Structures are given as C-alpha cells and as structure tokens.
Design a protein around this ligand. Structure first.
Ligand SMILES: C[S@@+](CC[C@H](N)C(=O)[O-])C[C@H]1O[C@@H](n2cnc3c(N)ncnc32)[C@H](O)[C@@H]1O
Ligand code: SF4
Ligand code: SF4
Ligand code: SF4
Lengths: 361, 10
C-alpha cells in the first residue's frame, strides 16, 4: 500500500507562542542519520506512491539545508520510481525568497497558518515576545504568490472566529485565497472543555458553520468556487461514501507521525508515551502498523455511540473525529463534543449541499 | 485520509 508520514523535523520547537497551541518535550532537530533511515525505509517499503508531510512545531526551524538533504535522498534512493508527494505546514514567519524558491521548484504543497484579518489573527498568534505576526504571514503569502508556490490557508476556529465569520471570509476573499481549511480549536487533551477565552464551544461552532456555509454557497451560486476542506469532504462522503479527510470516515487511521528522534505515533493528537509505536530506525512500517498499540488505538475508534446508531445523519457524519470523543484517559469514547453542532448544521445546510453535489455531477 | 492540520487538495 502507499505510505503517508507526518514528520516533525524540528520536533515541537517553535518561534511563536500562539495562545491556544498545545504542540509547542522537544527532541530537537532531526539528525541526518534519522532522516536518512526514514527516507530510505519509506522508499523501500511503500507501493504506488508515498507522501512526506512536515509539521511541528515550526518545521522551517529545521533549516533549508535539512530540506535540501531530503530532496537529495529522495532523488538517490527511490529505486522503485514511486511518485513522491511533499508538503509543509508553516507559520510563514521565517519564509523568505530562498524558502519560496525551494518550495516552488520542489513542488511542495504548503499550508500557511492564517486566522483571518489583522485583528483576528494577532489576538492569538503572537510571537515569543508577545508581539504581532500577521504582517509576517502576509509577507509569506506574498512570496508564495510571487514564486507560484501552491498553498492552502489553515485557519484555527476559535470563539472569536465564530463571532466574525463575515470578516474572516471577506479577508480571504479579498486576498484571493481559494483553498481554505478551518481547524477547530481544541482544548488540551483530557482538560475540562470550554475554559479558555478562545475555546470553541459547540454553540459557537454551530454559528460558525452555518454562516460560513452561507458565504460559501452564495459564492458557488455566483460561479466563484472556493474550496473549503470540511465542505469538500461532506461532498465526497455524499458522492463516494468516503472522504479523504481523516476524522470524516468514522474511524481512525495510522498517520505515522514521526518525531525528530524517529519515534512513531498513530495520530498528531496523540504523540504521547502510551501510543509510541516504536522507532522508524529499527522497525518496518508494516511492523509499526501491526503493533498491539496501533491495533488498539484504531479499534477503540470503532465503537459507535448509541445516539449515532439511530441518528439520521449517521451516514453523513459517522460520529466525527475520535479526538473530539475522547473526554477522559482510558474512559470509553463519548458522543462527539460537537454532535449538536453537526445536527443543527446539517438541518440548515443539507438541502443546499445536495444542490451542489448534483451540479458537480 | 489525512487530518485537517495537514494541507491537502481534493
Ligand atoms: C500547530 S501547527 C504546526 C505547524 C506550524 N507551526 C503552523 O502554525 O502551521 C499545525 C496547525 O495546527 C493548528 N493548531 C494549533 N493549535 C490548535 C488547537 N488547539 N486546535 C486545533 N488546531 C490547532 C495550528 O494553527 C496550525 O494551523
Ligand atoms: S506557530 Fe504553530 S506550532 Fe508554533 S505556537 Fe503557533 S500553532 Fe503552535
Ligand atoms: S483522532 Fe481524528 S485525526 Fe486522529 S486518526 Fe482518529 S479520526 Fe483521524
Ligand atoms: S450528528 Fe451526532 S448523533 Fe449524529 S452521527 Fe454525528 S455525532 Fe452521532
């Protein structure tokens, strides 16, 4: 089968201090021997194609020469002539001409984190000193357009986002950003939910989804296509019965998260000792996947909540992402935290989602 | 299937 990895080449290391972030133990920068062992194993084991996605942490802290070495390894060690996909998620604050050229020439797909216009973005996305970052992220987008880097925007949805969907959507529209991914702001794993100023509560999320869908659909009607990852996945589920977004298919998959020391985990939300599968230097990808830890991680997500069983939306929703059901350590999974939001949203949007699905055949 | 924190096109 193809192989897809999520790599943290600078570990959890980051140059910012975003208020909601729980991703920034740092294993430091991935060493060359780990990088080499990882790239060779993937190219030897994968069939069809493989994908390397660089995340963190701020992955550009690994430095350009790390990524240059990566490309050289891919060039030399792809004995099967697999297709290779590379991608990078970045805060954009360190992007300069050298990065933009590299990313463009090497066909990376880039995800740039931008939470909306200046005020909405800076409220949470602050630097180490507590200062603003929006202008530096705009500069990154500017460099990406200049050098034709393919990029999507990754926007975290906080309570403030829910109150200002008009400003956020209009800003991205003004900037001609056509590929958007809205990520729910999660409270830290196993903490009491909804305790922070930024916390995205179910009633905030319902409001966000309904208003976003309205702006998206009005555009659709007017022939302006805007790709919104969640709505695309619903469309996929409607037309094909499956989605290419993890969290939308009802059960978990092993994401092969590789930390900078080579340790491997099943999902970016669960880089914890109890889910450490082993080390990529010493195990095959098959062996990691077939661990008792991975099998257990996945199988836990197969439990269907009783409310879901009789839910009219079950074939559309599937219970949502396991991370949003995991309220307490080693307690069984609960109903999705956002269950009420999906129900209220589906009642509001489903007729028009079908409308769209028909028109894209 | 990839998670929504990773950039992807459908
Ligand atoms: C933390 S970052 C790592 C890559 C890079 N530092 C960046 O900002 O894009 C990965 C993505 O997850 C998002 N994220 C951070 N904290 C989150 C939370 N509590 N809930 C949901 N998404 C979050 C970030 O905004 C970013 O869009
Ligand atoms: S830039 Fe990314 S990794 Fe860094 S603190 Fe903000 S969300 Fe977290
Ligand atoms: S917790 Fe969510 S994102 Fe992680 S593997 Fe499970 S469904 Fe996918
Ligand atoms: S909307 Fe709620 S009850 Fe229905 S499938 Fe989704 S999580 Fe389950």
């Amino acid at each position: 089968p193809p192989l897809s990895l999520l790599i943290k080449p600078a570990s959890s290391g980051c140059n910012l201090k975003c208020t909601y972030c729980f991703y920034h133990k740092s294993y430091g920068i991935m060493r060359d021997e780990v990088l080499e062992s990882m790239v060779k194993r993937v190219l030897n084991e994968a069939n069809g194609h493989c994908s390397f996605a660089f995340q963190g942490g701020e992955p550009t802290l690994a430095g350009l020469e790390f990524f240059e070495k990566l490309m050289e390894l891919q060039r030399k060690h792809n004995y099967k002539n697999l297709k290779i996909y590379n991608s990078l998620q970045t805060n954009g604050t360190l992007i300069d001409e050298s990065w933009a050229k590299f990313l463009s020439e090497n066909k990376f797909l880039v995800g740039l984190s931008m939470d909306g216009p200046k005020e909405i973005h800076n409220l949470n996305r602050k630097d180490c000193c507590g200062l603003d970052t929006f202008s530096k992220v705009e500069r990154a987008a500017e460099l990406f357009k200049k050098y034709k880097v393919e990029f999507n925007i990754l926007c975290v949805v906080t309570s403030n986002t829910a109150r200002h969907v008009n400003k956020v959507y209009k800003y991205f529209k003004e900037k001609d950003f056509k590929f958007l991914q809205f990520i729910n702001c999660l409270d830290p794993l196993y903490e009491e939910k909804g305790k922070y100023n930024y916390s995205l509560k179910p009633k905030d999320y319902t409001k966000f989804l309904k208003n976003l869908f309205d702006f998206w659909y009005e555009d659709f009607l007017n022939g302006n296509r805007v790709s919104i990852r969640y709505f695309d996945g619903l469309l996929e589920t409607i037309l094909l019965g499956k989605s290419s977004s993890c969290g939308m298919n009802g059960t978990c998959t092993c994401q092969f998260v590789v930390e900078s020391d080579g340790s491997v985990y099943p999902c970016d939300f669960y880089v914890l000792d109890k889910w450490r599968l082993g080390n990529i230097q010493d195990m095959t990808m098959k062996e990691l996947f077939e661990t008792n830890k991975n099998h257990e991680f996945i199988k836990l997500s197969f439990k269907v909540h009783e409310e879901c069983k009789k839910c009219k939306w079950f074939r559309l929703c599937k219970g949502g992402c396991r991370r949003c059901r995991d309220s307490k350590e080693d307690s069984a999974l609960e109903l999705n935290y956002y269950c009420q939001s999906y129900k209220e949203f589906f009642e509001y949007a489903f007729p028009r989602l079908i409308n769209v699905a028909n028109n894209i055949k | 299937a990839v998670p929504s924190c990773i950039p992807s096109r459908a």
